[PDB]
Amino acid sequence: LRKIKIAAAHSLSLGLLPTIVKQMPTQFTYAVEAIDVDQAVDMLREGQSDFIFSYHDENLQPFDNIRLFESRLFPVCANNGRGEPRYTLEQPHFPLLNYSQNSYQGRLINRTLTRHAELSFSTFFVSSMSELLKQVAMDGCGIAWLPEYAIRQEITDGRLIVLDADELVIPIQAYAYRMNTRMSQVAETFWRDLRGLQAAL
């Protein structure tokens, strides 16, 4: 009861909901779905989800928005243990850990890798779950573009090394999308309290 159905993109539900539900002023019920970027417009218009936590989709930007945070995508990889990166960008056919071809982050990385034809890589692991790519990268199996907030503590400890920070960086902005049409009594209550909570992410 008093359910709030949220469908988030394949890699930003973790960085948001734990902090949201803990700091939420009043108590709701939550149902969370990991959807692709393509299924964002349709699920809102049909009412499949009351709110969609997605990136900067300018199609949704008859909708209302609220920017949750701002981050970047840094190419990272685990170290040898010597303090040197296990792989390197200038290495012939380095193992690449990428997102799916239909994900929002996957299209950004493949866009940058097309522009920078200097990088010679080999696809090794592809999945739209950023948590899976993060733990696969820590094993030292390849290079991955990971969000800064998702590896902030791992970057501090040299268990993941930043390989580039000038041109291979992809800025990302996460939003919470709502239809401008007024919703239930509980959805407006949740949307208001989240707006009163954006000073915590």
- Pair 8, 33: CB distance under 8 Å: yes
Q: Which residues of 63-98 are buried (b: 16+ CB within 10 A; e: fewer)?
A: bbeeebeebebbbbbbbeeeeebbbebeeeebbbbb
Asked whether position 13 contacts a second copy by CB under 8 A, the answer is: yes
- Token digits of residue 66: 């609220």
Q: How far is the CB of 135 from a second copy (least distance, A)?
A: 4
Quick check: 170 binds a second copy (CB under 8 A)? no
Residues 19-48 that bind a second copy (CB under 8 A): 21-22, 26-34
The residue whose two tokens read 């049409």 is: 181
Residue 121 binds to a second copy (criterion: CB under 8 A): no
**128 sits near a second copy (criterion: CB under 8 A):** yes
Q: Could you tell me if 97 and 124 are in contact, meaning their C-beta atoms sit under 8 angstroms apart?
A: yes
Q: Fill in the DSSP letter of residue 168.
A: S
Tell me, by CB under 8 A, how many residues bind a second copy: 33
Nearest to 43 by CA among 53, 30, 55: 53
**Using rule CB under 8 A, residue 132 touches a second copy:** yes
- Minimal distance, residue 42 CB to a second copy, in Å: 19
Residues 105 and 13: beta-carbon distance below 8 Å: no
**126 forms part of the interface with a second copy (CB under 8 A):** yes
Find the shortest distance in angstroms from Cβ 189 to a second copy.
16
* Interface residue with a second copy, options 69, 121, 124, 149 (CB under 8 A): 124
Query: Which residues in this chain contact a second copy in the complex, by CB under 8 A?
Result: 13-14, 17-18, 21-22, 26-34, 95, 100, 122-129, 131-132, 135-136, 138-141
